[PDB]
Design an enzyme around this catalytic site. Structure first.
Site, PDB file in Angstrom:
ATOM      1  CG  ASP A   1      -7.189 -17.137 -13.995  1.00 15.98           C
ATOM      2  OD1 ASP A   1      -7.698 -17.924 -13.157  1.00 15.98           O
ATOM      3  OD2 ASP A   1      -6.473 -17.524 -14.952  1.00 15.98           O
TER       4      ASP A   1
ATOM      5  CE  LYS B   1      -5.028 -20.238 -12.103  1.00 14.75           C
ATOM      6  NZ  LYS B   1      -5.964 -20.861 -13.074  1.00 14.75           N
TER       7      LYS B   1
ATOM      8  CG  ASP C   1      -2.480 -15.824 -17.507  1.00 13.32           C
ATOM      9  OD1 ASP C   1      -1.936 -16.541 -18.378  1.00 13.32           O
ATOM     10  OD2 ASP C   1      -3.719 -15.686 -17.424  1.00 13.32           O
TER      11      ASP C   1
HETATM   12  C1  LIG Z   1      12.735 -18.530 -14.500  1.00 13.63           C
HETATM   13  O1  LIG Z   1      11.668 -17.994 -13.720  1.00 13.63           O
HETATM   14  C2  LIG Z   1      10.484 -18.678 -13.635  1.00 13.63           C
HETATM   15  C3  LIG Z   1      10.459 -20.037 -13.322  1.00 13.63           C
HETATM   16  C4  LIG Z   1       9.250 -20.723 -13.247  1.00 13.63           C
HETATM   17  N1  LIG Z   1       9.190 -22.099 -12.911  1.00 13.63           N
HETATM   18  C5  LIG Z   1       8.288 -22.845 -13.808  1.00 13.63           C
HETATM   19  C6  LIG Z   1       8.039 -24.234 -13.230  1.00 13.63           C
HETATM   20  C7  LIG Z   1       9.342 -24.993 -12.991  1.00 13.63           C
HETATM   21  N2  LIG Z   1       9.106 -26.161 -12.126  1.00 13.63           N
HETATM   22  C8  LIG Z   1      10.309 -27.009 -12.103  1.00 13.63           C
HETATM   23  C9  LIG Z   1      10.108 -28.076 -11.031  1.00 13.63           C
HETATM   24  N3  LIG Z   1       8.901 -28.877 -11.312  1.00 13.63           N
HETATM   25  C10 LIG Z   1       8.675 -29.801 -10.192  1.00 13.63           C
HETATM   26  C11 LIG Z   1       7.708 -28.024 -11.485  1.00 13.63           C
HETATM   27  C12 LIG Z   1       7.955 -26.970 -12.566  1.00 13.63           C
HETATM   28  C13 LIG Z   1      10.369 -24.113 -12.278  1.00 13.63           C
HETATM   29  C14 LIG Z   1      10.512 -22.740 -12.925  1.00 13.63           C
HETATM   30  C15 LIG Z   1       8.061 -20.029 -13.459  1.00 13.63           C
HETATM   31  C16 LIG Z   1       8.037 -18.673 -13.763  1.00 13.63           C
HETATM   32  C17 LIG Z   1       9.216 -17.948 -13.879  1.00 13.63           C
HETATM   33  N4  LIG Z   1       9.265 -16.612 -14.167  1.00 13.63           N
HETATM   34  C18 LIG Z   1       8.433 -15.951 -15.020  1.00 13.63           C
HETATM   35  N5  LIG Z   1       8.620 -14.624 -15.232  1.00 13.63           N
HETATM   36  C19 LIG Z   1       7.840 -13.918 -16.060  1.00 13.63           C
HETATM   37  C20 LIG Z   1       6.804 -14.547 -16.732  1.00 13.63           C
HETATM   38 CL1  LIG Z   1       5.729 -13.661 -17.864  1.00 13.63          CL
HETATM   39  C21 LIG Z   1       6.604 -15.993 -16.511  1.00 13.63           C
HETATM   40  N6  LIG Z   1       5.595 -16.638 -17.152  1.00 13.63           N
HETATM   41  C22 LIG Z   1       5.252 -17.956 -17.043  1.00 13.63           C
HETATM   42  C23 LIG Z   1       6.194 -18.966 -16.821  1.00 13.63           C
HETATM   43  C24 LIG Z   1       5.817 -20.306 -16.713  1.00 13.63           C
HETATM   44  C25 LIG Z   1       4.484 -20.676 -16.829  1.00 13.63           C
HETATM   45  C26 LIG Z   1       3.502 -19.715 -17.054  1.00 13.63           C
HETATM   46  C27 LIG Z   1       3.818 -18.363 -17.156  1.00 13.63           C
HETATM   47  S1  LIG Z   1       2.648 -17.304 -17.417  1.00 13.63           S
HETATM   48  O2  LIG Z   1       3.176 -16.126 -18.050  1.00 13.63           O
HETATM   49  O3  LIG Z   1       1.677 -17.912 -18.292  1.00 13.63           O
HETATM   50  C28 LIG Z   1       1.895 -16.805 -15.998  1.00 13.63           C
HETATM   51  C29 LIG Z   1       1.150 -17.959 -15.327  1.00 13.63           C
HETATM   52  C30 LIG Z   1       2.867 -16.156 -15.016  1.00 13.63           C
HETATM   53  N7  LIG Z   1       7.441 -16.606 -15.662  1.00 13.63           N
END
Ligand SMILES: COc1cc(N2CCC(N3CCN(C)CC3)CC2)ccc1Nc1ncc(Cl)c(Nc2ccccc2S(=O)(=O)C(C)C)n1
Length: 268
Positions: A133, A135, A155
């Site tokens: 997976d 990507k 993930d």
């Molecule tokens: C604070 O740090 C983070 C911010 C975001 N984004 C999420 C989307 C968001 N935007 C805001 C603006 N919008 C326009 C779009 C959305 C901004 C912050 C995403 C990931 C992280 N950091 C992070 N570290 C460890 C894990 Cl462990 C994890 N895990 C994690 C975090 C989120 C989703 C999925 C996983 S996951 O663990 O399932 C894997 C896919 C990495 N995510």
């Protein structure tokens, strides 16, 4: 209505939601004794009929893996309805958002990211683990003290061990290897194919197989015709084009291993 276990709340202060999806909820959390920040990934187990939930695979693989280009597992807690994972928090967010924001990357930047990814893959493959997976959305951007960025792979939900050919059809259509689609048996190198697709996207902003009907998409992948269209790819080096080509070979025996990716002049 998550039933958070006592042992988690005892040592961690649960914070804001940083992401949400169909199977998991990820929150920021803070370790009480140190104030250090971590991520708490809450995986909702699938309920079946009667009072039981399906068992999950992610932790069996996560328990095995320790590498700098992989999100570290800190602790795990399994309860009947969900699974709790305390993991290192990567503040730069994920690569999907980075790509939408930045559009495309320079070759110096993309090769550094590929160097990171292939390192993770080399390591996993050394343990006979296929990720299946890979990507941008499963890749997190660590931002350094020096201003530089590094990728971390997360993930491990579809990840497994390869001991003879695998056949389960799974993944994201844009990134999925032809042998997966062909149902003739696959192994570790499906990850290289995925990395190839990512590298292609990094340099021009669009995938090599875009399709039209999910039929056209799958045929394109099975046929594997990789183009480097003008004007988009005109200023990109031959070295980059050659490497991406080797990662995207239909012939699995010819397709590069992760080691071969790391040895290529473009990533050095
Ligand atoms: C604070 O740090 C983070 C911010 C975001 N984004 C999420 C989307 C968001 N935007 C805001 C603006 N919008 C326009 C779009 C959305 C901004 C912050 C995403 C990931 C992280 N950091 C992070 N570290 C460890 C894990 Cl462990 C994890 N895990 C994690 C975090 C989120 C989703 C999925 C996983 S996951 O663990 O399932 C894997 C896919 C990495 N995510």
């Amino acid at each position: 209505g998550f039933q958070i276990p006592a042992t988690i709340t005892e040592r961690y202060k649960v914070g804001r939601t940083i992401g949400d999806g169909n199977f998991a909820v990820v929150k920021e959390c803070v370790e009480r004794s140190t104030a250090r920040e971590y991520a708490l990934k809450i995986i909702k187990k699938s309920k079946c009929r009667g009072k039981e939930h399906m068992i999950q695979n992610e932790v069996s693989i996560l328990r095995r893996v320790k590498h700098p280009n992989i999100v570290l597992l800190i602790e795990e807690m399994d309860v009947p309805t969900e699974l709790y994972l305390v993991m290192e928090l990567v503040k730069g967010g994920d690569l999907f958002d980075a790509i939408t924001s930045t559009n495309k990357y320079t070759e110096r930047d993309a090769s550094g990211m590929l160097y990171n990814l292939a390192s993770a893959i080399k390591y996993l493959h050394s343990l006979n683990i296929v990720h299946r997976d890979i990507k941008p959305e499963n890749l997190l951007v660590y931002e350094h003290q020096d201003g530089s960025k590094s990728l971390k792979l997360g993930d491990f939900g579809l990840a497994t061990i390869v001991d003879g050919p695998l056949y389960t059809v799974c993944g994201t259509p844009t990134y999925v290897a032809p042998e997966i689609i062909a149902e003739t048996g696959y192994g570790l190198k499906v990850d290289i194919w995925a990395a190839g697709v990512i590298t292609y996207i990094l340099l021009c902003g669009f995938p090599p197989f875009r399709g039209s009907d999910q039929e056209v998409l799958f045929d394109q992948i099975l046929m594997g015709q990789v183009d480097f269209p003008s004007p988009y790819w005109d200023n990109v080096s031959d070295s980059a084009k050659e490497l991406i080509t080797m990662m995207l070979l239909v012939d699995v025996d010819q397709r590069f291993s992760a080691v071969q990716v790391l040895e290529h002049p473009w990533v050095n």
